[PDB]
Amino acid sequence: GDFEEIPEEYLQ
Amino acid sequence: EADCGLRPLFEKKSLEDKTERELLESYI
Amino acid sequence: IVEGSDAEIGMSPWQVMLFRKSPQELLCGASLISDRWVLTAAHCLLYPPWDKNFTENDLLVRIGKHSRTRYERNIEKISMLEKIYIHPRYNWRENLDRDIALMKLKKPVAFSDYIHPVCLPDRETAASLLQAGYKGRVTGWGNLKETWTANVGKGQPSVLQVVNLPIVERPVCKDSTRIRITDNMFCAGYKPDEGKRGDACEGDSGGPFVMKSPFNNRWYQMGIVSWGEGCDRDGKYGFYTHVFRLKKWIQKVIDQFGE
Numbered sequence A: 001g002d003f004e005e006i007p008e009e010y011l012q
Numbered sequence B: 001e002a003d004c005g006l007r008p009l010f011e012k013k014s015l016e017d018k019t020e021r022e023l024l025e026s027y028i
Numbered sequence C: 001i002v003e004g005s006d007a008e009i010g011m012s013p014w015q016v017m018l019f020r021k022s023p024q025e026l027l028c029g030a031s032l033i034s035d036r037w038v039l040t041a042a043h044c045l046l047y048p049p050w051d052k053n054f055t056e057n058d059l060l061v062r063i064g065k066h067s068r069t070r071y072e073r074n075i076e077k078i079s080m081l082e083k084i085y086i087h088p089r090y091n092w093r094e095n096l097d098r099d100i101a102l103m104k105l106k107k108p109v110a111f112s113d114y115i116h117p118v119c120l121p122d123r124e125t126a127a128s129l130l131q132a133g134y135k136g137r138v139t140g141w142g143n144l145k146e147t148w149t150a151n152v153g154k155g156q157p158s159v160l161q162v163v164n165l166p167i168v169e170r171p172v173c174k175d176s177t178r179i180r181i182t183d184n185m186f187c188a189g190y191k192p193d194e195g196k197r198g199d200a201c202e203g204d205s206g207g208p209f210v211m212k213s214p215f216n217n218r219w220y221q222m223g224i225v226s227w228g229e230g231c232d233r234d235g236k237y238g239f240y241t242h243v244f245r246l247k248k249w250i251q252k253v254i255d256q257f258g259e
């Protein structure tokens, strides 16, 4: 969880 | 690619990075 | 990367991060070789001993990055994978022989000051440059050390790490290890007698070992970070996939099958 969240369009 | 391996911020503007000379010097 | 330093901005614009969607995590390095093709190590995608067998939809590639953890708005480009190709004779059972894989991107990535492909070597460049003592450059976001004291020391970097390392004579590579070395591998690193240190480490897997040709002043990817025993141990060396030796498979995958 060290990682800043990614834009949602990529995680889709 | 025709322009492969040429970095926009270095080779493309004739700027060297801080340690590439170490590589060149090893190629004897 | 052990005993490296922070990369300069744009220093490694072919560097690619292999990123797991869920849980969101770094898996491996990789490199950009054209607007639609990314090169990495087979073991980053397939390693049955660790129950590792990733599918396309498990993964993103993030291109143009510098900071390890930040989302680099307006700079990085995050790409979804179209297809994974693993070398059919990749030997995960024994010694990671032919540790190489290609990933096709769903859409071409736009090039920028931060995103630019590396060259792959031809026979002549490989023959001239892959010589003991000649130095290449390894980059990645992997661990800074093999071990450290938890919540007291620091083991992971904020940003891309870089180290320059000399190619090592093949008998020295072979005598450093009990693992069977093949012509599809070379090893790199300083000897205990030499002054300097440095190595890849966990999380650097699949990233590029590059050399700058003194003939045409272009960067060529000679190696892929493949395996080591420990990280930066005295008398041990990092082992790299010999990219040129596998280039006919690379060409086949791209030219006849994928284009």
Ligand SMILES: N[C@H](Cc1ccccc1)C(=O)N1CCC[C@H]1C(=O)NCc1ccc(Cl)o1
Residues within 6 Å of the ligand: C043, C047, C094, C095, C096, C179, C200, C201, C202, C203, C204, C205, C225, C226, C227, C228, C229, C230, C231, C238, C239, C240
């Ligand atoms: N300790 C075994 C040694 C081994 C080598 C060949 C066949 C099985 C085991 C290793 O190296 N691996 C295990 C799978 C992934 C790979 C890895 O951890 N590679 C990262 C690394 C560090 C330095 C550089 Cl270069 O790459």
Ligand code: NA
Residues within 6 Å of the ligand: C174, C175, C176, C177, C178, C179
């Ligand atoms: Na040996």
Ligand code: NA
Residues within 6 Å of the ligand: C189, C190, C199, C232, C233, C234, C235, C236, C237, C238
């Ligand atoms: Na070493």
